[PDB]
Scaffold this active site. Structure first.
Site, mmCIF file in Angstrom:
data_model
loop_
_atom_site.group_PDB
_atom_site.id
_atom_site.type_symbol
_atom_site.label_atom_id
_atom_site.label_comp_id
_atom_site.label_asym_id
_atom_site.label_seq_id
_atom_site.Cartn_x
_atom_site.Cartn_y
_atom_site.Cartn_z
ATOM 1 C CD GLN A 87 -0.903 2.172 4.839
ATOM 2 O OE1 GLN A 87 -1.998 2.775 4.579
ATOM 3 N NE2 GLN A 87 -0.816 0.821 4.911
ATOM 4 C CG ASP A 114 -4.124 -5.156 4.253
ATOM 5 O OD1 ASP A 114 -4.937 -5.606 5.087
ATOM 6 O OD2 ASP A 114 -3.891 -3.949 4.133
ATOM 7 C CG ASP A 152 -5.529 0.340 1.689
ATOM 8 O OD1 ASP A 152 -5.455 -0.877 1.758
ATOM 9 O OD2 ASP A 152 -5.411 1.174 2.686
ATOM 10 C CG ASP A 153 -3.226 -3.527 0.621
ATOM 11 O OD1 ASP A 153 -2.122 -3.202 1.121
ATOM 12 O OD2 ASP A 153 -4.286 -3.439 1.253
ATOM 13 C CG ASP A 182 -7.454 -3.580 2.011
ATOM 14 O OD1 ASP A 182 -6.506 -3.524 2.829
ATOM 15 O OD2 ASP A 182 -8.142 -2.603 1.659
ATOM 16 C CE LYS A 183 -8.919 -0.781 4.888
ATOM 17 N NZ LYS A 183 -7.919 -0.752 3.757
ATOM 18 C CG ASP A 240 -1.728 1.133 1.514
ATOM 19 O OD1 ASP A 240 -1.618 2.223 0.969
ATOM 20 O OD2 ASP A 240 -2.601 0.927 2.413
ATOM 21 C CE1 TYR A 275 6.528 -9.990 19.978
ATOM 22 C CE2 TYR A 275 4.632 -10.257 21.510
ATOM 23 C CZ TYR A 275 5.983 -10.509 21.187
ATOM 24 O OH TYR A 275 6.734 -11.286 22.095
ATOM 25 C CG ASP A 304 -11.869 2.293 6.973
ATOM 26 O OD1 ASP A 304 -12.416 3.087 6.221
ATOM 27 O OD2 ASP A 304 -11.038 2.663 7.854
ATOM 28 C CE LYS A 348 5.984 -6.555 5.684
ATOM 29 N NZ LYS A 348 7.469 -6.609 5.078
ATOM 30 N NE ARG A 360 -10.534 4.258 14.073
ATOM 31 C CZ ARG A 360 -9.860 5.388 13.949
ATOM 32 N NH1 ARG A 360 -8.568 5.419 14.240
ATOM 33 N NH2 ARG A 360 -10.485 6.486 13.588
#
Ligand SMILES: O=C(COP(=O)(O)O)[C@@H](O)[C@H](O)[C@H](O)COP(=O)(O)O
Ligand SMILES: O=C(COP(=O)(O)O)[C@@H](O)[C@H](O)[C@H](O)COP(=O)(O)O
Ligand SMILES: O=C(COP(=O)(O)O)[C@@H](O)[C@H](O)[C@H](O)COP(=O)(O)O
Ligand SMILES: O=C(COP(=O)(O)O)[C@@H](O)[C@H](O)[C@H](O)COP(=O)(O)O
Ligand SMILES: [Mg+2]
Ligand SMILES: [Mg+2]
Ligand SMILES: [Mg+2]
Ligand SMILES: [Mg+2]
Ligand SMILES: [Mg+2]
Ligand SMILES: [Mg+2]
Ligand SMILES: [Mg+2]
Ligand SMILES: [Mg+2]
Ligand SMILES: [Mg+2]
Ligand SMILES: [Mg+2]
Ligand SMILES: [Mg+2]
Ligand SMILES: [Mg+2]
Ligand SMILES: [Mg+2]
Ligand SMILES: [Mg+2]
Ligand SMILES: [Mg+2]
Ligand SMILES: [Mg+2]
EC number: 3.1.3.11
Lengths: 390, 390, 390, 390
Positions: B95, B234, B52-53, B132-133, B11, B229, B297, B232, B266
């Protein structure tokens, strides 16, 4: 004038897997048939897929079982194979033509054919159907309904021209025997046969009043190979409509309940037959792109294209499952597909053992130790302790 | 010939917020990869987003973990950042590359990678997934199903070539430990690990019969930063299909229940994983535009593109969630999303505290007065009167 | 102390047809078992029906396959036959005991038995199931799920006492062979057998850790009579629960998908297995009245009664399908029943021909003229004209 | 006059398994409390179960934390254990009193208590709740809603007597710390705590205007035993209603969304909290029989009994979930239960690892070989070949 309408269908590669066809395969086939048309081999044509199956619909005046027409189709499929499918290394390239195609399903059994010859009526509406992920007996229920079920075809009761009913030519694909049954009077006997969808398949239907050809389904006898019956799946069907034959809408009503059919994943399950829209229909280019097979390699789908013939030319095709009324049918099929899939590997979602295209039963029986049942009763405690300690 | 298939995803800005990408980002990336192709760095490529990826799917012969291929992707993302995202002041521009990007979520952790090297089969169908998400463990349930659940993958039971099962490489992302588990026999132990989706993630799957690579999921170890922690999210996933590997439709069946996954708003909620259509697929331009993230989202979405490889060239992609059968799945996900959202800020809709990407708990604990519980019992009336009078 | 739990079940008449039992049959049976209890033949008992099937649940210390216990049941069924069913001319009076009972289905094959002997645990929860309008293989899916499916029985993954799995005793009812399969490792082989629900039936299940009896299903080998296989339908099942055996709720979860089973009308259809409430449960009188079979002589139904054993006394029964959660399951079954019934006489709603309890195929083949297929092609026009003129 | 209302609850055996209670347990308890009433120990009482949990609701004038009242309850549970549960060998006989009860869940932790002392109002409506198969934090969402959510409790906005809000006493059950939060102003901080339902639990609520006790939930600190946190589940809750406290219907509205709660099978899953009817309510005998736990040992259920107090006598109870409006809520819960169960062993249907009452993770980690991740990368091919050859 007398005309022959022939659908000759084959899978010569999928994109990806067994889900769909590559659009260049359709484009290649259409271009090849356009050349045949220019040379006078055929009058007209339409090229389309449902799932991984390409139908070549051709009109001509060479009659049924004609070597030139069957050979034109074979050659078109072989050239699609070599020029397109092998080039892009499509899945099961040359599937139905090549016994050594790169796929794990039944290969090399050849194209299928549904064809009718008749005097072209003053108007000649016809419907071409194609199904993927199912057997030719998938059409038994719809064909019965449209020609014999008064809850489907109102004309049987209210159209005096239809009162005399229909003649069903049923093929026993195991013993290679043909039966001729007449409705209404033979309805119960007919159903006693054709309910066994894997064995007794409606191959042709004729009007009783005059013998006119009314429908032709693609079915052939099975082959017995390494002790299993091997069939040719993914059928095509031609139906003539109106004027004493079922109305276009009576034919379509016969598909409005998405009944369970045999096929789906690995040719070894039962699932609902979804009446599906085409993705696209291009009458000028003579190509329609049909639906994809997705969850569990399906569900099984049927597409319907309507045409009007004139001196053998084909005006069409028209997607006849394109109506919100059929959205409800599709939603029902989608829900039934989800319900039945929760059964996993169990009959009747999985097919009867002799009806499965894939099986591991010989591998299983070669490894799992049997115990004669009478002796097992005496030894059960011993055998259980041996597994436990084992 | 041996080929490597690499998906490298990042992203580098959203349009608007975290909902989607700007189409010029895809166009820029595709143009950059076309230049790399002309220079011989890569064989072929496909560029697409989910939410968004942006995924850069590349085929090449440089092997896994190759600096040139990873560097080509990084450079493409950095140039998209500088030429497109920063120009239009997109949200979270850069990002995943820039620790100081203008967004409030986890930044600067880098792209993710899913890659496999193998001898290209006589037909080589592959599926590329992007979500995504959600977290990489979102794929644990589907990967388990497609490789180990006989209610999903019929071939495990009926295809003798699959009878021996699969090998799962599971990464403990907290302790940086790898486990190798074999199904069917280790199924219960495997599930005891991978049910903890935030910790034990399926990274690779191999066929047991020959060790062939079957799937690769993008997951990396967590980083411990300011006592939390940091992962990464998506993920992207590559699956090889057919011929002893699960059928395309068995892979897709594994996504037909829209299970709850961690992520959504979030990075701190649970919601259903919706199998989503692409908005558009353009095989010639080598670009697909995936779905937007909207309510809250999300909900979390996964897209599926199928391809056939030939000498490393990619024919595709084909949207494999495009079927009315999957409309039912999407409708289920939409209804579940509405149900669960009525929970608001409460577990298990909100994630466990250690799994939340956003938290205000330190701010809260710095302001709200605690009372040791044993002493509070004696003073409760006094404290309540003090609030009341207060 | 060691105890034996025996369910011995039979249909000795319906009220009306095959829909239900007459309540005086249950009352007579309970009174007869109360006399046996007073004499010390048995410890305790419970009498109940599902559809037209009466289950005599008896606890005793005489072991499995005991002539006194089996004889007590037979005598109870014979006296119900003569005193109640023949008096009121119930339908199929003496059905399972008398080859000449007045009904048209399979008669005179005898009662069925599900029994287990074991050391009574410090708490001994057991569930007794009874199904009507289905075959013993109807329980294959539930038994597999509860003992081997980690999506059903959480304990397989999260209860260390269950980690070692279970041993399935599978009966081939055609060849009279027994197989012993162990899960998890033999899951695929097991499913390759027991998915063929009419042939390979789970008869017993044992805990792998210690060999403890866990379940017993009523199934016997088929008899070959006038060239058809003849089975004994309407099974009963005993399951021990908890403490390393599946929880009561894991056993019940295995019935929460109302899967298609073979049976329903005329022993010749497939329909959903509905988990049904009892109409009434009277623990003091030791009688429960189960559900009726209505539309199309079903749908197939299963009832579940839970008990706690103490020195062989039976506290219970408790209707375990009595929860709004199971109302949803029943509603699903009702909807699926309506969907599938629209198929009428066609497979897979109608069963495969060898699996049908009723058939008219010999009558049909004696009247309908066959034509060898190769010669039929030459004569088709002639034969169609002959029907037309005819 | 000042009155104390105490609910003291325990599971001392199930019938069968953990599904329900034996009715003689309720009858025994009611008879014992009737004797205490005759002696003047208590004013009045009501005895009822939800699932396998028996609530003893008692009114008296001995105040909170009274040894005589707590001891009366303990003795009643011990006598039910010895006279009823051990006699019938019920499952988990003496569960909450005996560390060595015959069940596999958390045992011997003791009864739970929800109690309030107050001046009896001119009318004193109260609601007693009981839940089974869930944690005390299951009530966090409802308690928040009824006291602080203007979308639930209209009176917060339209009843000037409620405008000042409420005081929440929140227990951190890990660190044994109490927080006092006031709504509306502290709503966000409150939610930051109580959304973590396993750690921060609403124990009491007081009216801000005068400090009046408004609700009391049964929650206690956790015990750290063999490195796991061990809690006391299956909570009970007392709420005072009306006249500046939420209306009975505002309290009930707070349960009208069947939110996901932690518990269900093995204390290790998430499922919807179903507001359930009582099977029977007998005000004269002072006994209500609550719902059974069935599929997957649930879903989790809550029952609600309303009363009016007069000089401490309890008129009631009245089943407050008995309305067609709540049938819709139950149907929603039943559907959500079916959806989520298809996730099987995966978070977030399975709980986070530290929240699971049952785990096999130590057994798993003792057997499955780990590989340090960095060294595994070099050896992966070797290890895969070793499994393959292996
Ligand atoms: O109502 C219909 C046509 O009316 P329309 O032209 O719309 O007035 C159709 O249902 C026809 O009656 C039906 O298709 C049968 O048509 P024929 O085969 O008799 O022409
Ligand atoms: O039935 C199917 C294909 O039949 P088709 O080509 O439409 O006749 C598929 O379900 C395949 O059996 C399945 O994809 C497995 O294929 P292989 O991996 O064995 O080729
Ligand atoms: O409308 C209601 C009562 O009207 P009713 O007696 O049926 O006319 C209720 O909703 C009350 O307003 C509500 O319960 C609040 O009551 P108080 O706590 O103010 O008495
Ligand atoms: O949560 C449960 C019981 O809790 P409870 O008594 O209501 O606190 C059940 O799901 C049990 O965990 C389950 O039935 C297994 O019980 P055991 O066989 O381990 O006793
Ligand atoms: Mg194919
Ligand atoms: Mg096909
Ligand atoms: Mg096929
Ligand atoms: Mg085919
Ligand atoms: Mg973003
Ligand atoms: Mg994203
Ligand atoms: Mg994120
Ligand atoms: Mg991200
Ligand atoms: Mg009967
Ligand atoms: Mg019966
Ligand atoms: Mg029968
Ligand atoms: Mg029977
Ligand atoms: Mg209990
Ligand atoms: Mg409980
Ligand atoms: Mg508990
Ligand atoms: Mg409890």
């Amino acid at each position: 004038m007398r005309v022959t309408v022939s659908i000759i269908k084959a899978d010569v590669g999928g994109f990806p897997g067994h889900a769909h066809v590559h659009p260049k395969m359709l484009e290649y086939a259409a271009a090849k048939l356009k050349e045949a048309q220019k040379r006078g081999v055929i009058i007209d044509y339409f090229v389309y897929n449902v799932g991984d199956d390409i139908s070549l619909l051709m009109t001509h005046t060479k009659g049924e079982d004609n070597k030139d027409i069957h050979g034109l189709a074979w050659e078109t499929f072989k050239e699609v194979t070599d020029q397109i499918a092998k080039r892009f290394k499509l899945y099961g390239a040359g599937q139905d033509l090549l016994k050594d195609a790169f796929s794990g399903n039944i290969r090399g059994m050849g194209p299928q054919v549904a064809e009718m010859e008749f005097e072209e009526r003053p108007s000649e509406p016809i419907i071409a159907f194609a199904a993927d992920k199912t057997e030719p007996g998938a059409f038994n229920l719809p064909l019965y309904k449209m020609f014999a079920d008064p809850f489907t075809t109102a004309g049987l009761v209210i159209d005096p021209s239809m009162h005399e009913g229909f003649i069903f030519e049923v093929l026993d694909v195991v013993e290679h025997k043909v039966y001729l049954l007449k409705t209404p009077e033979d309805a119960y006997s007919l159903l006693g046969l054709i309910g066994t969808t894997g064995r007794y398949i409606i191959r042709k239907v004729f009007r009783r009043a005059d013998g006119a050809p009314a429908a032709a389904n693609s079915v052939e006898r099975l082959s017995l190979i390494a002790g299993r019956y091997v069939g040719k799946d993914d059928p095509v069907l031609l139906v003539r409509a109106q004027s004493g034959l079922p109305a276009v809408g009576e034919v379509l009503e016969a598909f409005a309940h998405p009944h369970l059919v045999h096929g789906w994943m690995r040719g070894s399950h039962a699932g609902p037959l979804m009446p599906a829209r085409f993705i696209s229909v291009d009458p000028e280019r003579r190509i329609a792109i049909g639906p994809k097979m997705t969850r569990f390699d399906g569900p099984p789908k049927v597409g319907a294209l309507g045409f009007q013939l004139h001196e053998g030319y084909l005006e069409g095709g028209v997607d006849l499952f394109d109506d919100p009324a059929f959205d409800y049918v599709r939603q029902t099929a989608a829900q039934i597909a989800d319900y039945i899939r929760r059964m996993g590997p169990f009959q009747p979602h999985r097919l009867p053992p002799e009806e499965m295209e894939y099986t591991a039963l010989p591998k299983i029986l070669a490894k799992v130790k049997p115990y004669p049942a009478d002796q097992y009763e005496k030894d059960r405690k011993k055998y259980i302790e041996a597994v436990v300690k084992g």
